Amino acid sequence: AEVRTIKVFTTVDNINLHTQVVDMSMTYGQQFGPTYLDGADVTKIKPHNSHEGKTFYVLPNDDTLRVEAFEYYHTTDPSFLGRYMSALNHTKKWKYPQVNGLTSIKWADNNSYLATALLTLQQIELKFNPPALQDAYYRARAGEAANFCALILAYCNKTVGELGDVRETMSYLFQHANLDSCKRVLNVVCKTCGQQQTTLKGVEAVMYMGTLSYEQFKKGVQIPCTCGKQATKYLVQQESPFVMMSAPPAQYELKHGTFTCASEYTGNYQCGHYKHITSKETLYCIDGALLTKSSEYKGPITDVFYKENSYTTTIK
Ligand SMILES: [Cl-]
Ligand SMILES: [Cl-]
Ligand SMILES: [Zn+2]
Numbered sequence: 385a386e387v388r389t390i391k392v393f394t395t396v397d398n399i400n401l402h403t404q405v406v407d408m409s410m411t412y413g414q415q416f417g418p419t420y421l422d423g424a425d426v427t428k429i430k431p432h433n434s435h436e437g438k439t440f441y442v443l444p445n446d447d448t449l450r451v452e453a454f455e456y457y458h459t460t461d462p463s464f465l466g467r468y469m470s471a472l473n474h475t476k477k478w479k480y481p482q483v484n485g486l487t488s489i490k491w492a493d494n495n496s497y498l499a500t501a502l503l504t505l506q507q508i509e510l511k512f513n514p515p516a517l518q519d520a521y522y523r524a525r526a527g528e529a530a531n532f533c534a535l536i537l538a539y540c541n542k543t544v545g546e547l548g549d550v551r552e553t554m555s556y557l558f559q560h561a562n563l564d565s566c567k568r569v570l571n572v573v574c575k576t577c578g579q580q581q582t583t584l585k586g587v588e589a590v591m592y593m594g595t596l597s598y599e600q601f602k603k604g605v606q607i608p609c610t611c612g613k614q615a616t617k618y619l620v621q622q623e624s625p626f627v628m629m630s631a632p633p634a635q636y637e638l639k640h641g642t643f644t645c646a647s648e649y650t651g652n653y654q655c656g657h658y659k660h661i662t663s664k665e666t667l668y669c670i671d672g673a674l675l676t677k678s679s680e681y682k683g684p685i686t687d688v689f690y691k692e693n694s695y696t697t698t699i700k
Pocket of ligand 1: 395396397398400
């Protein structure tokens with residue numbers, strides 16, 4: 385029997401290429417293990433003539449690829465590249481319209497949480513650490529967001545179509561961002577126990593769960609003390625370029641000029657839809673490809689983002 389071969393390249397990062405000679409009588413899987421062509425699983429396919437010179441993603445299956453994959457993605461999760469490829473096979477088919485000057489996502493595959501996450505990132509100062517996210521985010525800002533959205537799904541361990549939470553999604557992305565300079569000082573005052581200051585750094589310095597209002601967080605929020613009293617927690621010092629205030633969805637009034645952007649969630653714990661609100665010359669509501677405007681906004685808000693640089697309390 386006549387042996388036929390083609391040259392292809394394998395990769396884990398789509399930058400560093402590895403020359404391979406493949407036998408056209410054997411599947412990609414038999415030669416490389418799980419193999420993907422621009423997100424499509426070709427593990428059970430035999431090489432085509434049209435494949436010559438093309439790049440295939442493989443799993444990090446030797447030491448060189450293990451190092452290349454960690455350096456690019458900053459993960460050693462064995463299932464990561466397969467999850468990234470499985471997502472990309474869908475996100476490459478999504479549309480990414482420019483809405484009010486931002487890259488959004490046309491609704492598909494239950495992706496509203498990703499649209500509001502993507503819109504938010506374009507309005508806050510954030511630098512990613514993994515080259516994969518740096519490279520994909522640059523492309524997303526330019527309007528080609530398929531790789532970025534597939535990476536969000538992979539980093540968050542979410543599949544296409546799965547219910548997502550914006551706060552959790554932002555937590556994962558912030559873990560892979562340089563927030564090392566961010567600092568928060570809180571004071572908690574109990575009329576029985578006295579006062580306790582806490583310092584938070586990095587992601588914990590920019591995220592708070594319990595109120596949407598940055599102003600209320602400065603004045604004080606009531607929380608339980610271990611003694612059984614209500615204590616007051618308030619912000620003493622903030623050093624960060626933004627803050628994110630989150631809460632269970634509740635009817636909330638957004639006032640033009642008092643916040644950067646916000647997420648709205650309509651539905652229940654099992655099922656629902658996110659929209660994005662941005663405060664510009666007026667209030668714009670971006671719902672995937674859809675855009676409306678209003679002077680006032682009230683709805684079931686879950687996350688609000690605010691601009692910051694340096695804040696020090698006047699509370700003694
Ligand atoms: Cl590679
Ligand atoms: Cl970046
Ligand atoms: Zn107490």
